[PDB]
Amino acid sequence: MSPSDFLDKLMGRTSGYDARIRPNFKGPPVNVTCNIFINSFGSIAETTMDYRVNIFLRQKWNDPRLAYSEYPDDSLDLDPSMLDSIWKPDLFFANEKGANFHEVTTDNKLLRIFKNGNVLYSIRLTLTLSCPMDLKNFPMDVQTCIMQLESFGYTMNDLIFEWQDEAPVQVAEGLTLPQFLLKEEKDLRYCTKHYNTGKFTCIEVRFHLERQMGYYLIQMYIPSLLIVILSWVSFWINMDAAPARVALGITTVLTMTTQSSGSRASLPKVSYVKAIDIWMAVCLLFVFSALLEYAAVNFVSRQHKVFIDRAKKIDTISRACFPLAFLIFNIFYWVIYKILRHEDIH
Amino acid sequence: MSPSDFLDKLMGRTSGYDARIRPNFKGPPVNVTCNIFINSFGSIAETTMDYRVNIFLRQKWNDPRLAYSEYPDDSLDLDPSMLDSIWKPDLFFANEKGANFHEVTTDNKLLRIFKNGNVLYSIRLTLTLSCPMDLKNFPMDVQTCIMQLESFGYTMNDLIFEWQDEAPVQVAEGLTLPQFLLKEEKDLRYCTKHYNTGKFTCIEVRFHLERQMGYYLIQMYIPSLLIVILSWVSFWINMDAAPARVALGITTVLTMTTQSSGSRASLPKVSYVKAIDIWMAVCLLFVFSALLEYAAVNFVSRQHKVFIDRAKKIDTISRACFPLAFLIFNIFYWVIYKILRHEDIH
Amino acid sequence: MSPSDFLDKLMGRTSGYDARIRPNFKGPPVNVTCNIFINSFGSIAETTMDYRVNIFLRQKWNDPRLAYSEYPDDSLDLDPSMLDSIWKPDLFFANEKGANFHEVTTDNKLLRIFKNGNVLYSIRLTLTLSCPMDLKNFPMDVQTCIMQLESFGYTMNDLIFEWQDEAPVQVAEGLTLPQFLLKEEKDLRYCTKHYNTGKFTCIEVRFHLERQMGYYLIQMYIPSLLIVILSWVSFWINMDAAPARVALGITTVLTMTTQSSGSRASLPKVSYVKAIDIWMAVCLLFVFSALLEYAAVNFVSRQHKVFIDRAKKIDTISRACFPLAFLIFNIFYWVIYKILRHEDIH
Amino acid sequence: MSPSDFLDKLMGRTSGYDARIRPNFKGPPVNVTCNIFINSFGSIAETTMDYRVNIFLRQKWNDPRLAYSEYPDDSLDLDPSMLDSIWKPDLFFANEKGANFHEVTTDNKLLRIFKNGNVLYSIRLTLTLSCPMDLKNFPMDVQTCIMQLESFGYTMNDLIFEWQDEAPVQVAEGLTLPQFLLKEEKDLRYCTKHYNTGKFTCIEVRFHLERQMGYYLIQMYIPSLLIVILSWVSFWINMDAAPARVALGITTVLTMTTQSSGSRASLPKVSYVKAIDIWMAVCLLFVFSALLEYAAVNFVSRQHKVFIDRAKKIDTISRACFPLAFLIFNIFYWVIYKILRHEDIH
Amino acid sequence: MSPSDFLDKLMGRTSGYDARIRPNFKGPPVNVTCNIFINSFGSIAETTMDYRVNIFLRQKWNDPRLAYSEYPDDSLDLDPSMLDSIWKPDLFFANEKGANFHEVTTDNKLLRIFKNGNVLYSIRLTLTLSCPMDLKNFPMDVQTCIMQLESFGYTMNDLIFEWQDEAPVQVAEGLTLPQFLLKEEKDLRYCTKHYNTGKFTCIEVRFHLERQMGYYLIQMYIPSLLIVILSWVSFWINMDAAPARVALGITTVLTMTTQSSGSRASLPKVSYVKAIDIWMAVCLLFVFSALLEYAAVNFVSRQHKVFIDRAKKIDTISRACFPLAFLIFNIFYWVIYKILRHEDIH
Numbered sequence A, B, C, D, E: 001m002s003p004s005d006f007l008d009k010l011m012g013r014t015s016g017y018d019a020r021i022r023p024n025f026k027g028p029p030v031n032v033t034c035n036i037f038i039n040s041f042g043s044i045a046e047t048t049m050d051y052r053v054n055i056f057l058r059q060k061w062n063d064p065r066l067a068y069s070e071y072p073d074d075s076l077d078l079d080p081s082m083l084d085s086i087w088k089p090d091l092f093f094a095n096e097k098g099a100n101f102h103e104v105t106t107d108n109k110l111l112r113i114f115k116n117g118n119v120l121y122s123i124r125l126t127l128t129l130s131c132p133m134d135l136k137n138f139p140m141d142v143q144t145c146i147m148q149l150e151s152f153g154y155t156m157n158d159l160i161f162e163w164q165d166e167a168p169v170q171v172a173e174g175l176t177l178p179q180f181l182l183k184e185e186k187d188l189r190y191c192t193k194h195y196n197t198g199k200f201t202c203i204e205v206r207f208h209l210e211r212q213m214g215y216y217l218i219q220m221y222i223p224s225l226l227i228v229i230l231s232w233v234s235f236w237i238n239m240d241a242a243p244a245r246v247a248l249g250i251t252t253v254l255t256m257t258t259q260s261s262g263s264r265a266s267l268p269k270v271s272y273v274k275a276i277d278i279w280m281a282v283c284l285l286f287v288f289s290a291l292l293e294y295a296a297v298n299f300v301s302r303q304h305k306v307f308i309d310r311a312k313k314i315d316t317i318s319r320a321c322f323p324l325a326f327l328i329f330n331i332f333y334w335v336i337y338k339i340l341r342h343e344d345i346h
């Protein structure tokens, strides 16, 4: 017989197969085994708190109404246009904001029925999945994106999802991200839902993303530190050259301001304080204080010999005090942002 | 009987069920009970005056044409492909700008018919809902987004919507927003429409959003205040050092200008005046006035002893007068923007 | 009879109703009465020269093939899935760039057939409509957006559109725009098309939009004016302090430049000259000329007593001449842009 | 007979009309006459090298299988839902990147069959058409956008396209563009394709666009020229005032830099050199050279009377030499960009 | 016979053709020959790591069930609406993120059946294909975009893809890119997939893109070099003029900062270090070090004849040492970025 006419006999009207009735309709629940292959991963966006993925989803279950022994071939293949003639699980992605299937050329779907009634069902689809991001430690933040597979209308006494044991989630080689770095280790969890209706099956996977810091180091942190160092050279300039020390102080404040305002187009638009904002505020307070120090030296120095040496003492104290307090701030900043804040205990 | 063939008998041609006729067609109106579960909430945009939501919508009503007692099961389940065989309310979202259903895997829909004829109908859908925003008190503004559920073509003697009594609107845990903060308290109101055609049912929910201020404090308000303070140190510099006091005055004006123009890429594009614009204008008038004060001191001081002390008196008066009037402005600014303007009386 | 089976008798095959034949097929033209209710209005974009609207469109006409007297109910309701069984006008929006209907929940459509054969047809739809904008007087410009309703394939001896007499165009309360302000008065016009094929019916509505000026006043015009005033204080500084007057002149030019370049991210991207560009160019010519005045004073003053007083005379003349010519420019600018240019004569 | 039942007799099963067979199937090719009416024109984008159009497309040909004489009416009208019952040319736009039809209200389509068998077929559609743009002479560039109408699967012995003789391409009145200006003169060409399969018909139209220069003149070219002029006033300042001439030179370089970097957000993002980039680089080399001239004057002047006058001679030579070489550069720049480069020889 | 009725006899129910069974169902695999014609190429985006293409795809294979000799014509043409009546390969693009067909006018598809049973199948489609980009050598980077054609559900003993021998991949003339330059040479490779299911056929093509450097040379590298040169003229200024050398040093640092921050809006947003970032950091370290040199000269020079000449020696050494070390840096920079890094060995 042609492999198709055998399918029309297996899921036939004379056979009485009903695609709206689950396998083992009265007995134990259906056990669906799931795989994910991630083809692409990106478009991670803080404005919408989501990311975009392109996956192969494979589901495997057993349907005893589809067992056959008379046909010699040990596997049959359903046409993708006849997919509504067979029962399929009602899997949906719980944190999905948008999805579509792929129909370029032939529909990107595949269904294979085995001799014992096992069904293999593999589809290709694009997802936009939501992920809440924190950003409090922004240059040095670690994010966790999840992906939850849930049944829409079957409780856990009719339908149960499980991950594959060998490789349930795989990622294609050679994927890059402009901002993040996808780690190799992934969690497979149960996130079983308890509602008023009953207990609904749900499995999830967690991906860990670490932001790279090299660009922010070379473009924001180090230029701000050089501007802070440049504000300290006023303390070695002679206190009589007021146009020199005042113009150096205020141009250092202006350079600090153009550095902040120019860095303001390439940062995430949030409303709370980030760690780079703390750094940029302390560097501005440092260049503001170096100009107030000269305002005090210039005012104390003109009160007409005891007054000349008190003003020179303010300069010699500021020569050691400004770099020391800036080293203490750097120690507490990098310690509390690279040791005292790790959120991957999972 | 298979649960499906029983459905084909209940809504059968021999039964004479008509999906275009409401339940209790001659008698009292249909009472629909509604729930909302908000899965995601975001994309709040001032350019388009809208926000994006992803919800579960559940409707419950009674259809006496669907009551059955012969079948043992106390609940039946309609296939999502047979949903046009049953009557459903014509609910629409009155402030919707765009919407779609979810068909990833199986259609994200569910209909359950009980023994007494009660119908439970649960769908998943994405909305873009309009919300007019004010922005007059922008760093410190509070917004209210609503969501109106209305019948399209039935008056209130045929169809009535009501919220559930226990939990009509719930929000998923762990949702974050980049700019706002969704409050926990929600209003459930009637917004019944009165038209020429008659009285149309309509229920709504109000969400309250408060903008976070910490980033605007650390990046806009405090640097402007430091620049204003830096403009006051001219009054303690000797009045003979004209290149020092003129260059400090005009570089303080330039720093104020680069601070404003750099803050100009991360603010909402509206055409009216915001509170941050008031603050930025007053700080510019303060650094403009400190340079006019030196122009007066420098001009009065050269008129050739009575003229030297009048110019020194302008400096000693400005030393107390500029910080005092700036403290008075700060008191009236933060009082009228954090006490005299609350719009959540609802 | 069930209200549906009566519809299947009225537009029946035995009745011989043909949905492809207009009412009064041989006689006088069909008269369609139109209403518009505007739910939302926004997304006004100069880059694409269009705006976005969300309306209810209601059409009313008479079909004598649909008159019935045997049924007791004085109004019937066609199902939105049976809308291709009835004749409808082929209304299209002549300046539409994009459109779609709304199918969230049930299709957002409604058709009501009365006893005398009158049809009421109400649909909800989203439009993107084109509008050419001028922008020559940009901070102070007034725009006119139109909306044209035309028949696609019927001449004015078959189909005629008319506005309702009581309220053909209404707008929902509480709509805001980020940049514009929609006026209350609307024009209802005929814009009848004359083609080679014949005379085609077409009605239109005009909306008037006025841009708000308060933000541009507080952020662009007033800071530029303060910078121009700051360039005049060089004339009161002693002519011997060349580092003071040269540094004040060139830093005033730099402040004028950072003010222009920072305002350059929030303006519409056109290729012709706007009124704000005229203002920004004249303020730059004013701060350029104040520095050329000192270059002349400094050069004339050193030619070695007659030369000292000629240079002092240039300063005393510039003290009155620069503010006077700037007041004359302000008078001609605001007069020709707020009196001599009104384009709402309509 | 009803005009429809006559259509069902003309294209009937008893008539044996086949919509998959072209008219004159064995004989001479079909001659299709084409018109274009452009409703809107815009969204010209250098990032994607495309533009957007909204047109009416009208095709006219003769089908002798559709000739009829028994019916009194000299024109019939096919319903837009029955359009697959008739043969139509397989016209496609060869440089299209995206297209869609308009289905707001009734489908925006129209087909009219005459007595002699002539068919008039008019549709409304939106196109995104590709256009390669050059941008080497960017402020002063002229672009040419084309629009090619080709048959997909018929060689020129089956199907031939021709433009109408009276008005094949018309544009609606009152269209504006933010950046360009659409000229009135249009080319109608043949662009016949020669492939391995055979000779395929193809007609095209060329539109000419000229960029407006007024905004770039008032905002980029003239401020740069004023900054260059301001760098020349150092040559008239006394050579002993080193803080004045050094601060004026470096602040002029900084003003030139903020002028360039602020103009950097409103220019097209390409990777090759534009004419404005040439202008901005030469103006920077001019303000760089004026500061090197003072570095030479200041160094030569202190070598301890012969040295004082050699340094004064460098100043007096630079007073005439810098404006002269800048006038020569302006003459060669505007001559080679407004005379020696015209690309509309077509 | 009409060419259609012959098709209905060839793929007839009496013929028993089954479109779900491949040709040579029991025997050797089907050999499909593929061509690509690229109509447009662009939208290369680093944020999403993808590019957009518009191609003609042509597939050729042999179907012995479609051989016919009775008909005189040596080629038949299937209607695009009957394409599901014939077997077609299940080609899909393995790195596709989005795709669609073109249905403007008639569907842009074509199928031709020859006498011996050869099938030619040509479709037009738009692709968004993923490409990982590196950007470590960003101004001077070379990218490689691929395009993989794979069978979805057939192993290599049923279906085999091959490129054409004469011209499998062609590109239309006159395509331009805003940033890149598409090379003429293309690789044709096998990328055969080995899975658990078996061996799946897959062919690919590689395109090579080189970024143009002229704009980055004239706008970023050369202005930074002029600012570095301007920082060296302090060494030729007299060491007693402290306001001149301090103001020149700090204004050179500020100019370097506005140059970097203004270049910060037109660069790709990645998180790692690019070569332009290395260049911009070294130029900032050079202008920072020239100001530290004067801070040392000014401090050493005032310690009260031995001290005057040690400070003059620091100036005379810095006059030769700063340009030399900057020439060494330029030599190592351009050598390691234009010789030691070529990645087109392929």
Ligand SMILES: *[C@@H]1O[C@H](CO)[C@@H](O[C@@H]2O[C@H](CO)[C@@H](O)[C@H](O)[C@H]2NC(C)=O)[C@H](O)[C@H]1NC(C)=O
Residues within 6 Å of the ligand: A024, A028, A029, A030, A031
């Ligand atoms: C799906 O898997 C579950 C769990 O593995 C199966 O439930 C078990 O079935 C065995 C039958 O041998 C019982 O002994 C266990 O007590 C069951 N466990 C639970 C928790 O119910 C279930 O039978 C499987 N379904 C099918 C159709 O095979």
Ligand SMILES: *[C@@H]1O[C@H](CO)[C@@H](O[C@@H]2O[C@H](CO)[C@@H](O)[C@H](O)[C@H]2NC(C)=O)[C@H](O)[C@H]1NC(C)=O
Residues within 6 Å of the ligand: B024, B028, B029, B030, B031
């Ligand atoms: C829907 O709810 C309304 C209001 O609860 C019901 O209307 C009431 O019906 C009771 C019947 O016992 C009357 O006594 C009341 O006077 C009615 N109130 C009003 C305001 O009409 C209505 O019957 C319900 N519909 C159905 C189908 O049960």
Ligand SMILES: *[C@@H]1O[C@H](CO)[C@@H](O[C@@H]2O[C@H](CO)[C@@H](O)[C@H](O)[C@H]2NC(C)=O)[C@H](O)[C@H]1NC(C)=O
Residues within 6 Å of the ligand: C024, C028, C029, C030, C031
């Ligand atoms: C549609 O309206 C037009 C104009 O009101 C009607 O045309 C008029 O019909 C009356 C019939 O009493 C004539 O006396 C007028 O001379 C007509 N005017 C014109 C300009 O033709 C038309 O009859 C209406 N159509 C229908 C179906 O009622």
Ligand SMILES: *[C@@H]1O[C@H](CO)[C@@H](O[C@@H]2O[C@H](CO)[C@@H](O)[C@H](O)[C@H]2NC(C)=O)[C@H](O)[C@H]1NC(C)=O
Residues within 6 Å of the ligand: D024, D028, D029, D030, D031
């Ligand atoms: C379509 O137009 C072409 C060209 O005008 C016609 O081809 C000509 O037909 C006339 C018949 O009187 C011949 O004398 C010419 O020699 C033909 N020219 C060419 C170049 O073939 C063609 O007949 C037209 N098609 C139809 C159906 O009328």
Ligand SMILES: *[C@@H]1O[C@H](CO)[C@@H](O[C@@H]2O[C@H](CO)[C@@H](O)[C@H](O)[C@H]2NC(C)=O)[C@H](O)[C@H]1NC(C)=O
Residues within 6 Å of the ligand: E024, E028, E029, E030, E031
């Ligand atoms: C498709 O091409 C393959 C390879 O060219 C063909 O396989 C060969 O068939 C010949 C038959 O003459 C054998 O001699 C070779 O040994 C085969 N090679 C391999 C690697 O199998 C195959 O026959 C072709 N398919 C069809 C339908 O013609």
